[PDB]
Ligand binder design. Structure first.
Ligand SMILES: O=c1[nH]c(=O)c2ncn([C@@H]3O[C@H](CO)[C@@H](O)[C@H]3O)c2[nH]1
Ligand SMILES: O=c1[nH]c(=O)c2ncn([C@@H]3O[C@H](CO)[C@@H](O)[C@H]3O)c2[nH]1
Ligand SMILES: [Zn+2]
Ligand SMILES: [Zn+2]
Lengths: 157, 157
C-alpha cells in the first residue's frame, strides 16, 4: 500500500517539473486503496502560490467526492507538507498523512526554510493528532533524491 | 485607511454568510490603498475546505496582477488567519497583515481551536517576518461582533 502510493506521488513530482506546471512535489489522495486525486504542484501553471501539490490534490478530491471532508481518505506527499499544506490537510480532515522526503531535502536546493511546527510537534497553539508516517527505506530514499535530480529543470518560487 | 479596508473585509464576511457561500470571514488585499481583491470564505460554494477568505483573496490578487508574489500588497482579514491561511500569506510574500478579531472569537461559536503559532510569535520551525497588526478599538469591536451577529446563520465546517 504505502510504497505504491508514495511512488505515485514521486512520479507526479517528476511529471510536474517536466510539464513546467510547478516545482518537484506530488501528492496522491486515496480512499480505501482507490485513488481519488493524483496531482503535482501547479503554482506556475495556475499563477497561484497556494497551488502546492497537497492543496491541489485536496481541492480535486473534494470536488470529485462532493464533500468538503476527506475523513475516510489518506494523503501521500512526495515531500513533507509545508505549514500551509499541513493546515489544509488538517482542515480537510484527512485521516492519515504519509510523506517521503524531509523538508530539509527541498530546502537544500533553495526552497524557503519554511517548516510546519504542528507536523513536527513543536507548537504552543497548534497541535495535531493526525496520524503521520514518515516513510523509510526504499520509497523514502527515492523520494529524497527528487530534489537533486530535478534541480536544474525548474525555477525556484 | 486600515479601518476602511478592515471594515470592507468584515462586510465581505457578512455578505458571504448571507449568500450561503461559506462562513463569516472576509479578506481584502490592497496595493498602496487600491483594492486588488475583495473576498469571503467560499468553502461551501466551492466544496473546497481550502477556500478560506484569505486563500481566496490571495488566489484572486495573484490572478489580477498576473504573478505569484504580492510583496507590494497588504492583506486585511476580518478574523485572525488560521495556520493554513497564515502559511499562504507567507508564501505569497504579502508585506503586511491587519486582522480584526482574535481566533477565539470564531472558536467561541463553533470553529476548531486551530491557531497559527507563527502569527502569535510562538513558531519554532515557521518564522514569519511580515508586519502584523491586530486591530484595536472600533476595528476590533466590529470584527468581534461578526461572530455574535452571524451565529446560527450558516452551516459550520
Ligand atoms: O507542501 C509543499 N507542497 C508544494 O507543492 C511545494 N512547493 C514548494 N514548497 C516549498 O518546499 C519547502 C519544503 O516544504 C518549503 O519552502 C515549501 O514552501 C512546497 N511545499
Ligand atoms: O483563516 C481563516 N479563514 C476562513 O475563511 C475560515 N473559515 C473558518 N475558519 C476557522 O476559524 C477558526 C479561527 O481561525 C479556525 O477554526 C479556522 O479554520 C477560518 N479561518
Ligand atoms: Zn505546501
Ligand atoms: Zn484560514
Amino acid at each position: 500500500s504505502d510504497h505504491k502510493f508514495l511512488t505515485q506521488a514521486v512520479e507526479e513530482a517528476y511529471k510536474g517539473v517536466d510539464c513546467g506546471d510547478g516545482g518537484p512535489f506530488g501528492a496522491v489522495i486515496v480512499h480505501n486503496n482507490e485513488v481519488v486525486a493524483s496531482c503535482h504542484n501547479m503554482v506556475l501553471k495556475y499563477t497561484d502560490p497556494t497551488a502546492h501539490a497537497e492543496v491541489t490534490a485536496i481541492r480535486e478530491a473534494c470536488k470529485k467526492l462532493n464533500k468538503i471532508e476527506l475523513s475516510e481518505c489518506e494523503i501521500y506527499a512526495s515531500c513533507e507538507p509545508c505549514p500551509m499544506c499541513f493546515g489544509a490537510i488538517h482542515l480537510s480532515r484527512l485521516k492519515r498523512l504519509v510523506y517521503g522526503a524531509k523538508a530539509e531535502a527541498a530546502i537544500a536546493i533553495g526552497f524557503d526554510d519554511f517548516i510546519a511546527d504542528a507536523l513536527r510537534g513543536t507548537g504552543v497553539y497548534q497541535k495535531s493528532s493526525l496520524e503521520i508516517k514518515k516513510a523509510d527505506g526504499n520509497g523514502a530514499a527515492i523520494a529524497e533524491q527528487v530534489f537533486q535530480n530535478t534541480k536544474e529543470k525548474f525555477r525556484l518560487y
